[PDB]
Amino acid sequence: MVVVAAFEGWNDAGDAAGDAVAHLAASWQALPIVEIDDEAYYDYQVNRPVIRQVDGVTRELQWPAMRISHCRPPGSDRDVVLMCGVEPNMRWRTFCDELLAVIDKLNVDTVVILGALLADTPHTRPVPVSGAAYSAASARQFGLQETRYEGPTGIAGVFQSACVGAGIPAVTFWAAVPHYVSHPPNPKATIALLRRVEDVLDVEVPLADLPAQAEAWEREITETIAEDHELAEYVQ
Amino acid sequence: MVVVAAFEGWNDAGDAAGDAVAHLAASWQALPIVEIDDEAYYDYQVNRPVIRQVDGVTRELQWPAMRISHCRPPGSDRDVVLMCGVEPNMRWRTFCDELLAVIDKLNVDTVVILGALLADTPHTRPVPVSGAAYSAASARQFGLQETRYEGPTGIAGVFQSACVGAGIPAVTFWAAVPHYVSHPPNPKATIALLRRVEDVLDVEVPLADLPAQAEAWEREITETIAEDHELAEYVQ
Amino acid sequence: MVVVAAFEGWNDAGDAAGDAVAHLAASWQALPIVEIDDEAYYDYQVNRPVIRQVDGVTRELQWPAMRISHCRPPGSDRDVVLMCGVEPNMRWRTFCDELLAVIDKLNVDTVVILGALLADTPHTRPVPVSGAAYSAASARQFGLQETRYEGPTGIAGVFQSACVGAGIPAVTFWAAVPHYVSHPPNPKATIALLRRVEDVLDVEVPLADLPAQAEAWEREITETIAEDHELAEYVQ
């Protein structure tokens, strides 16, 4: 099989990577199989659970977790295993070992981790993509890389590194979102990340209505443009 | 028996619920019995311990914990078990199971969880109270409810939900504190919460000098103004 | 043996204590022996690991931890055991028990914990030092003490207290750094802390180039006198 994973919060800005995986799961109608709920991994003041209360009674309680679901794009015999959920607060090493065990039983060939970061970049020009891979040969996609060559990492980079150590090829892509538009209905970068998924897994992914949403997005950010304009700086 | 519990920090604003339970324990002279100290539940950078040092030496070290004490209002037949302490950072599920075991041994009939939140509300008019209960028949006290009908919860709501699942009747009340006066000597809401305690447990609670403190409080907030009849805004 | 320990983050401001221990380890060429890596102690969103990536590939992954190394100052025949690393987020009690086991195997006589805090104090006058010790006689170095006589503590104070309880003499010193110059290249307080280390352990520490760096530091803060005022205020 093959994996596309994405982690919320720190490792995802504008919800680009989360939305990317969401879009795959919608398009190809993914089947839930495994959910990693363990309280060994989660600080619940940081990642609070979600309550749903109606007419004086709670009707639903939702705990932070890692959702793993399964997929088959219509033409292909690539199974695609999707992973999505919040970045745990603890026991990362064992969290990664767990995911690897899932990987092992499902006979996964390749892992692709999507993420997104805030950078100094125009919204009126393409999405910069950065990342890392399992070797210098695999960096065929990159000579250079992401905002931190040295510095703090998240679960994306760790897990990536846990795969490489485990001997599974693994690549992470990071989409650069303009810091001034941080609100998380961003489709532009989601597109960009999805295309990287095509590139690694070699199966076409239907973008559907995303371009329309991107073009509407980009126009209606240029909408708020009375004298507020560090753009020249950024554009070049 | 019967429980009144309250959790600090997120679930308590103005220290209204904490002060409510404090006031019960003072009034009825509660006897400490159980203290849940476990380091399985607490992130100590978030909830730091309190040191006491005198003349070059530490004389006391105080660890965050859950204090459980016992009570008997004088006229009353009924034991009141009080719970007070900071909201754990982790293993909520097992934390709640633990409390339930305490509940089981002590044969508790009913649980009442107090909390308080910051809202848009005048300080010159009554305290809005919201919450949830074990059945819609029991929401007699409420048609409509708390700031998040859907959204992130705290230990109050979880524990509440753990009681309901365990088959113990449980109700939570949330007092609405004006965000502009957040400093935590608030008596007004404490009163309000206490009255909800009367309503559920049906034992009168002596308020003593709380009204005096409330009226002094309310007058001395109406004292501090220029430019800022924002309160006229919340006339409505 | 004898210990000099220092903890990062909360307990070290200006990187005074960290730099102090660093300077000892450089000067006396300390030998790494033990590294406490355990994921029982660390919340990894708070203390993130450090990635190093070069030309599309990660080349290094560095996990937060407690480094313990060994030392023998040249004249002396006492071993100095150095400890340095970030303040854990959890299981402090067991973290301290662990360190104590190290202490036990190494037959440690005395522990000295260095720290630093932001205070209202001039940069043009000496470094105020505060702290606590194992007894009132031991406070010969202090009648009086730390910013928090009562209030929240860190791992420094806890560990200190764990040593005292274990029967090992232990002293903590806290250097007062001017809040307005917080940037962590401060040598002034590092000197001060180092001198306290001399005082307890009675072995001279070569300061090397530190004074030069301190006087340069102090002159080039007095250099930026465009805004700053209220000199007199702190000056007494």
PDB file of C-alpha atoms in Angstrom, chain A residues 73-158:
ATOM      1  CA  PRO A  73      -8.678   5.383  -6.317  1.00  0.00           C
ATOM      2  CA  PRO A  74     -11.039   4.146  -9.038  1.00  0.00           C
ATOM      3  CA  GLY A  75      -8.622   3.166 -11.859  1.00  0.00           C
ATOM      4  CA  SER A  76      -5.717   2.063  -9.674  1.00  0.00           C
ATOM      5  CA  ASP A  77      -4.780  -0.937  -7.520  1.00  0.00           C
ATOM      6  CA  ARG A  78      -2.859   1.352  -5.224  1.00  0.00           C
ATOM      7  CA  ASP A  79      -4.508   1.164  -1.877  1.00  0.00           C
ATOM      8  CA  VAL A  80      -4.105   4.533  -0.263  1.00  0.00           C
ATOM      9  CA  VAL A  81      -4.042   4.655   3.547  1.00  0.00           C
ATOM     10  CA  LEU A  82      -4.936   8.037   4.965  1.00  0.00           C
ATOM     11  CA  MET A  83      -3.956   9.382   8.363  1.00  0.00           C
ATOM     12  CA  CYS A  84      -5.290  12.516   9.926  1.00  0.00           C
ATOM     13  CA  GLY A  85      -5.397  13.995  13.372  1.00  0.00           C
ATOM     14  CA  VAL A  86      -3.893  16.298  15.933  1.00  0.00           C
ATOM     15  CA  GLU A  87      -0.244  16.293  16.837  1.00  0.00           C
ATOM     16  CA  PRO A  88       0.147  14.363  20.074  1.00  0.00           C
ATOM     17  CA  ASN A  89       1.707  16.113  23.028  1.00  0.00           C
ATOM     18  CA  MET A  90       3.788  13.175  24.283  1.00  0.00           C
ATOM     19  CA  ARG A  91       5.346   9.729  23.812  1.00  0.00           C
ATOM     20  CA  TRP A  92       6.122  10.645  20.181  1.00  0.00           C
ATOM     21  CA  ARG A  93       8.693   7.863  19.911  1.00  0.00           C
ATOM     22  CA  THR A  94       6.129   5.188  20.871  1.00  0.00           C
ATOM     23  CA  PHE A  95       3.381   6.945  18.868  1.00  0.00           C
ATOM     24  CA  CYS A  96       5.568   6.541  15.797  1.00  0.00           C
ATOM     25  CA  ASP A  97       6.343   2.900  16.644  1.00  0.00           C
ATOM     26  CA  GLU A  98       2.592   2.337  16.844  1.00  0.00           C
ATOM     27  CA  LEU A  99       1.907   3.859  13.405  1.00  0.00           C
ATOM     28  CA  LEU A 100       4.791   1.799  12.041  1.00  0.00           C
ATOM     29  CA  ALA A 101       3.135  -1.377  13.328  1.00  0.00           C
ATOM     30  CA  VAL A 102       0.023  -0.362  11.388  1.00  0.00           C
ATOM     31  CA  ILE A 103       2.278   0.227   8.419  1.00  0.00           C
ATOM     32  CA  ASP A 104       3.872  -3.145   8.827  1.00  0.00           C
ATOM     33  CA  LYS A 105       0.617  -5.138   8.892  1.00  0.00           C
ATOM     34  CA  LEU A 106      -0.740  -3.282   5.912  1.00  0.00           C
ATOM     35  CA  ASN A 107       2.476  -3.756   3.935  1.00  0.00           C
ATOM     36  CA  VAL A 108       3.009  -0.118   3.137  1.00  0.00           C
ATOM     37  CA  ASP A 109       5.601   0.775   0.478  1.00  0.00           C
ATOM     38  CA  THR A 110       5.756   4.533   0.714  1.00  0.00           C
ATOM     39  CA  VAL A 111       4.758   7.316   3.084  1.00  0.00           C
ATOM     40  CA  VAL A 112       3.900  10.909   2.144  1.00  0.00           C
ATOM     41  CA  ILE A 113       3.497  13.463   4.927  1.00  0.00           C
ATOM     42  CA  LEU A 114       1.790  16.769   4.144  1.00  0.00           C
ATOM     43  CA  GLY A 115       2.253  19.985   6.087  1.00  0.00           C
ATOM     44  CA  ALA A 116       1.971  23.756   5.877  1.00  0.00           C
ATOM     45  CA  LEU A 117       3.753  26.710   7.422  1.00  0.00           C
ATOM     46  CA  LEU A 118       3.412  30.490   7.612  1.00  0.00           C
ATOM     47  CA  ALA A 119       6.038  32.339   5.594  1.00  0.00           C
ATOM     48  CA  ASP A 120       6.831  35.688   4.027  1.00  0.00           C
ATOM     49  CA  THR A 121       5.264  35.047   0.602  1.00  0.00           C
ATOM     50  CA  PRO A 122       2.761  36.830  -1.694  1.00  0.00           C
ATOM     51  CA  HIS A 123      -0.801  35.562  -2.087  1.00  0.00           C
ATOM     52  CA  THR A 124      -0.708  36.800  -5.690  1.00  0.00           C
ATOM     53  CA  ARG A 125       2.003  34.333  -6.778  1.00  0.00           C
ATOM     54  CA  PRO A 126       2.420  30.517  -6.632  1.00  0.00           C
ATOM     55  CA  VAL A 127       2.731  28.402  -3.477  1.00  0.00           C
ATOM     56  CA  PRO A 128       6.308  27.742  -2.432  1.00  0.00           C
ATOM     57  CA  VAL A 129       6.759  24.081  -1.513  1.00  0.00           C
ATOM     58  CA  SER A 130       9.575  22.758   0.651  1.00  0.00           C
ATOM     59  CA  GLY A 131      10.503  19.536   2.353  1.00  0.00           C
ATOM     60  CA  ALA A 132      12.710  16.517   2.778  1.00  0.00           C
ATOM     61  CA  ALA A 133      12.967  12.962   1.544  1.00  0.00           C
ATOM     62  CA  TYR A 134      14.645   9.602   2.330  1.00  0.00           C
ATOM     63  CA  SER A 135      17.798  10.301   0.303  1.00  0.00           C
ATOM     64  CA  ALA A 136      19.702  12.851  -1.845  1.00  0.00           C
ATOM     65  CA  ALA A 137      18.578  10.949  -4.904  1.00  0.00           C
ATOM     66  CA  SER A 138      14.961  11.225  -3.682  1.00  0.00           C
ATOM     67  CA  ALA A 139      15.419  14.944  -3.206  1.00  0.00           C
ATOM     68  CA  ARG A 140      15.160  14.946  -7.035  1.00  0.00           C
ATOM     69  CA  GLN A 141      12.074  16.993  -6.050  1.00  0.00           C
ATOM     70  CA  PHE A 142      14.347  19.284  -3.880  1.00  0.00           C
ATOM     71  CA  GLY A 143      17.920  20.604  -3.920  1.00  0.00           C
ATOM     72  CA  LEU A 144      16.950  22.892  -1.046  1.00  0.00           C
ATOM     73  CA  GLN A 145      14.298  22.736   1.757  1.00  0.00           C
ATOM     74  CA  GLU A 146      11.862  24.067   4.435  1.00  0.00           C
ATOM     75  CA  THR A 147      11.863  27.170   6.678  1.00  0.00           C
ATOM     76  CA  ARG A 148      13.921  25.277   9.391  1.00  0.00           C
ATOM     77  CA  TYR A 149      17.012  23.494   7.998  1.00  0.00           C
ATOM     78  CA  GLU A 150      18.044  23.636  11.646  1.00  0.00           C
ATOM     79  CA  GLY A 151      15.549  24.242  14.478  1.00  0.00           C
ATOM     80  CA  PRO A 152      12.525  22.783  16.284  1.00  0.00           C
ATOM     81  CA  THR A 153      10.477  20.095  14.473  1.00  0.00           C
ATOM     82  CA  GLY A 154       7.001  18.580  14.820  1.00  0.00           C
ATOM     83  CA  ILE A 155       5.544  15.078  14.607  1.00  0.00           C
ATOM     84  CA  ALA A 156       5.621  15.266  10.806  1.00  0.00           C
ATOM     85  CA  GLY A 157       9.423  15.444  10.683  1.00  0.00           C
ATOM     86  CA  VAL A 158       9.854  12.920  13.488  1.00  0.00           C
TER      87      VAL A 158
END
